[PDB]
């Protein structure tokens, strides 16, 4: 509660913005000139604020659009069917009650398609609008006055919501993706260092977050394409997809780290005294990889191009040194006596897996640099100082 508000102050301004919009609409409802029709249909404006106010501007824009589509299509269809119902003079209510079944069936069958799982809020508004207009106009045969009035109030509630959301400390969806990429770049480095230290001792959250947030990075990219130019990102078409490409290149590397963490939990493990022979090349490889990942993160955050010096030189030097050390001492990995128990053979052969995995991680590091260069070229990044 209070501890969470003090930890993050971005969650105490959104609630007060919603309270302010609600108080404004309420003041306009209480302090208005009395009239017969408004009196009974005036609560339709304070209930739209509670249904259209979202955390970011892009979603607010993207979802309000779908809801409006659902509403206008349902209203037009309902009005057309209500007009057509007259022809069957003898059985008006039979046809009207036979149209609800066919529309509920079609609207429930079209929302179970696997590609429409994220759009159920647009099918619910369609069913609600269709039913309400048919069941609310049967008495007094008024179908063009029960919609034109009840739509202006919804428009006014959505206008107040959008104005308050957009002009009082806006929160943007491209600034949560630019930040998420930088956070993942540091989590992967922390996980790698923790894994190498845990293995050499006499790690989970980082790679789990960097391997499981692809959907967050696709929703934020589907919300950031609706927002107008602002701040440092001033261009009509911003290359938002290159951030997803860089994130995918980093997750491909993070799989190796997940496998190195799995190696620590394996039932079959190697004698520590044998691990302490290669104790000096794994920590150097880890330190160099973590430093490289943190330098890439820092460059991405400050939006600067890569300088001339090749950042992969020291890591490749440390990996070649690892390879040489493994080559000199390969007599500890196998047993030449049997050349032509099994638990001790597997325990011995378990160290080579860890070394080969570290080596593969290094061999993969290059794709992330290539993706970063592509991103820094598509978007005009500042020249390094």
Ligand X SMILES: CCCCCCCCCCCCCCCCCC(=O)OC[C@H](COP(=O)(O)O)OC(=O)CCCCCCCCCCCCCCCCC
215 binds, options ligand X, a second copy, none, Cβ within 5 to 8 A by partner type:
none
CB atoms within 10 A of CB 105: 10
**Shortest distance in whole angstroms from residue 302 CB to ligand X:** 39
Contact mark string toward ligand X, 286..325, x via CB under 6 A: ----------------------------------------
342 binds, options ligand X, a second copy, none, Cβ within 5 to 8 A by partner type:
a second copy
311 binds, options a second copy, ligand X, none, Cβ within 5 to 8 A by partner type:
none
Whose CB is nearest to ligand X?
A: 75
333 binds, options ligand X, a second copy, none, Cβ within 5 to 8 A by partner type:
a second copy
Q: Which residues pair with 382 in a beta bridge?
A: 304
Those residues whose C-beta lies under 8 Å from the C-beta of residue 211, and which sit 6 or more positions away, are 251, 254, 255, 258
**Shortest distance in whole angstroms from residue 381 CB to a second copy:** 28
Q: Which stretch binds ligand X (CB under 6 A): 95-103, 105-113, 127-135, 305-313?
A: 127-135
The C-alpha atoms of residue 315 and residue 187 are separated, in whole angstroms, by 19
Which is closer to a second copy, CB of 266 or CB of 380? Answer: 266
The C-alpha atoms of residue 62 and residue 60 are separated, in whole angstroms, by 6
How far, CA to CA in Å, does 361 sit from each of 74, 86, 315, 334?
55, 73, 11, 24
Which is closer to ligand X, CB of 185 or CB of 223? Answer: 223
Stated as kind and residue range, the H or E segment containing 355 is helix 342-378
Residue 119 in contact with ligand X, rule: CB under 6 A: no
User: In the set 56, 60, 62, 71, which binds ligand X (CB under 6 A)?
Assistant: 71
List of long-range contacts for 5-14, beta carbons under 8 Å, 24+ apart: 10/171, 13/168, 13/169, 14/55, 14/171
Residue 81 in contact with ligand X, rule: CB under 6 A: no
The C-alpha atoms of residue 313 and residue 315 are separated, in whole angstroms, by 6
Residue 264 in contact with ligand X, rule: CB under 6 A: no
275 binds, options ligand X, a second copy, none, Cβ within 5 to 8 A by partner type:
none
Which is closer to ligand X, CB of 14 or CB of 44? Answer: 44
The C-alpha atoms of residue 82 and residue 96 are separated, in whole angstroms, by 8
What angle is formed at CA 244 by the lines to CA 242 and CA 246, rounded to 5 degrees?
Answer: 70
Structure letter (DSSP) for residue 140: G
Can you give the binding site for ligand X, defined by CB under 6 A? Answer: 40-41, 44, 47-48, 51-52, 64, 67-68, 71-72, 75-76, 79, 125, 128-129, 132-133, 147, 150-151, 154-155, 158
């Amino acid at each position: 509660a209070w501890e969470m508000g003090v930890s993050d102050p971005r969650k105490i301004v959104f609630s007060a913005k919603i309270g302010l919009a609600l108080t404004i609409v309420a003041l306009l409802i209480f302090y208005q000139e009395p009239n017969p029709d408004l009196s009974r249909y005036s609560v339709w404006a304070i209930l739209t604020v509670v249904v259209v106010f979202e955390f970011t501007i892009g979603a607010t824009l993207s979802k309000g659009f779908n809801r409006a589509l659902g509403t206008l299509s349902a209203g037009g269809l309902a009005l057309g069917m209500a007009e057509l119902s007259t022809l069957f003079g003898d059985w008006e209510e039979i046809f009207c009650t036979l149209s609800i079944f066919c529309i509920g069936f079609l609207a429930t069958f079209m929302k179970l398609y696997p590609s429409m799982k994220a759009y159920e809020y647009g099918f619910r508004v369609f069913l609600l609008t269709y039913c309400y207009i048919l069941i609310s106009g049967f008495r007094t045969g008024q179908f063009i006055e029960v919609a034109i009035s009840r739509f202006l109030l919804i428009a006014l509630g959505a206008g107040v919501s959008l104005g308050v959301n957009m002009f009082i400390y806006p929160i943007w969806a491209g600034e949560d993706l630019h930040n998420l990429v930088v956070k993942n770049f540091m989590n992967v480095a922390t996980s790698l260092e923790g894994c190498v230290n845990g293995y050499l001792r006499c790690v989970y959250k980082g790679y789990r977050s960097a391997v499981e947030s692809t959907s967050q990075e696709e929703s934020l990219m589907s919300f950031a394409i609706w927002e107008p130019p602002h701040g440092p990102y001033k261009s009509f078409n911003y290359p938002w997809k290159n951030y997803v490409k860089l994130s995918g290149a980093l997750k491909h590397c993070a799989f190796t780290v997940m496998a190195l963490h799995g190696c620590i939990l394996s039932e079959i493990q190697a004698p520590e005294e044998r691990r302490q022979v290669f104790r000096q090349e794994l920590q150097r490889v880890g330190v160099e990889g973590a430093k490289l990942l943190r330098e890439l993160g820092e460059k991405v955050k400050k939006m600067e191009k890569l300088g001339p010096v090749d950042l992969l030189f020291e890591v490749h030097l440390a990996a070649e040194e690892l390879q040489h050390k493994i080559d000199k001492k390969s007599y500890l990995l196998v047993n030449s006596e049997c050349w032509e128990k099994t638990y001790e053979s597997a325990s011995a052969l378990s160290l080579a897996t860890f070394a080969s995995l570290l080596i593969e991680f290094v061999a993969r590091l290059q794709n992330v640099v290539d993706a970063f260069k592509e991103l820094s070229q598509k978007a005009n990044f500042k020249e390094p100082e």
